[PDB]
Amino acid sequence: MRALFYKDGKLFTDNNFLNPVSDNNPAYEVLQHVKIPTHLTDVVVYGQTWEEALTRLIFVGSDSKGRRQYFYGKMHVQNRNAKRDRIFVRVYNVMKRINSFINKNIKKSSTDSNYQLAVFMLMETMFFIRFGKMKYLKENETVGLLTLKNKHIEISPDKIVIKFVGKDKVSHEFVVHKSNRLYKPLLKLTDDSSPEEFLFNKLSERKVYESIKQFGIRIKDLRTYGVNYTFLYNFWTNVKSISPLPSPKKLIALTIKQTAEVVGHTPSISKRAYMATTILEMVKDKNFLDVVSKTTFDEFLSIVVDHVKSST
DNA sequence: TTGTCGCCCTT
DNA sequence: TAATAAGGGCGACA
């Protein structure tokens, strides 16, 4: 995996194009099978065979903003999507321990780090909001969980409304009702007199990473879980409640659309955003939809989890 | 030592 | 559509 430098269809070992490689260089095979997008500059192409490229990083270049954009082989992408299903199972398996950490800690002092960590995790289990790196608030004015400010939180008699503009300039709005364990903690954490101050003012990227580590997962894995949970809950609702049960793919398309609408994915991106490939393997036998119709969601969830575990 | 950067990878 | 944008995780850095 040496990075070779690309200029008009030709490869060089150096960024100034003084050292051309042999026309027989294995990397020319890669160029037979990929198209380099023409908006990229300063392109590098890794020196490897096509069979190797298929499984990992293929080429990289700069977009108009100067960001290095990284392009992977289809087997890498396939693998990545498999890992997502496994991550679903991993989070599923650790949620009890997370809720134990949350439920213990939300009884604590408002300016305690572990209290803020408990509220952070609890917001994640509820709304699946992205991590919220500082970088993107600075760069793009993007807000996520870590970058929430008191201005984003509105308290009213029996509810709390969280409103912000997250990735891709999509507005999000979440509601916490009085009966919910999150209500009182959030009520006490938010500081209405400091609207420009961060809500998690005792947190830091370092603190969040060190805390999530105890559960053997990343914060983004919580989102993966919540989004696919919502997916599966929609699929289950649909099989249970739709009057004339729709065709297999009309059913999935409908379920992708309902999820996309609430998560805030575009109708294009939503297509492949969730665990629709899993539902595809499962509908492959005739009994499935019958079984699902006769399940509680918890037992449906366990059937789906069991499928993923035993898939590979 | 601890908030920020940049590379790699993901959505 | 057709053209191709912007998040997270974590080592690296002073």
Side-chain angles (χ1 to χ4, degrees), chain A residues 130-228:
Chain A
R130 298 180 191 83
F131 183 101
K133 292 181 29 148
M134 294 296 323
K135 170 185 312 287
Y136 299 116
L137 210 219
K138 175 172 163 184
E139 193 191 323
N140 294 323
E141 282 300 298
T142 304
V143 175
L145 228 214
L146 228 212
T147 40
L148 237 29
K149 284 170 183 291
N150 299 298
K151 59 179 179 201
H152 303 298
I153 305 137
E154 315 114 79
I155 290 87
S156 71
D158 293 327
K159 63 170 198 295
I160 299 177
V161 181
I162 305 146
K163 278 181 71 171
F164 60 98
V165 176
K167 179 184 186 193
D168 288 343
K169 293 305 171 55
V170 174
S171 291
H172 291 99
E173 181 175 328
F174 299 109
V175 59
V176 187
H177 294 108
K178 173 165 47 179
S179 59
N180 198 263
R181 57 184 177 156
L182 212 205
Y183 179 83
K184 285 192 180 85
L186 187 52
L187 188 59
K188 102 176 81 228
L189 183 57
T190 198
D191 177 16
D192 286 52
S193 69
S194 305
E196 306 301 334
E197 294 279 332
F198 289 108
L199 173 72
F200 301 104
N201 66 159
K202 293 288 272 279
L203 299 187
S204 77
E205 297 183 344
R206 230 173 248 285
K207 287 174 172 127
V208 176
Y209 292 142
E210 52 178 74
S211 180
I212 196 60
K213 188 164 190 55
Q214 83 193 275
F215 306 114
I217 54 174
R218 298 80 52 85
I219 294 295
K220 75 174 290 284
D221 300 335
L222 266 12
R223 175 169 171 90
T224 300
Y225 177 85
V227 162
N228 291 292

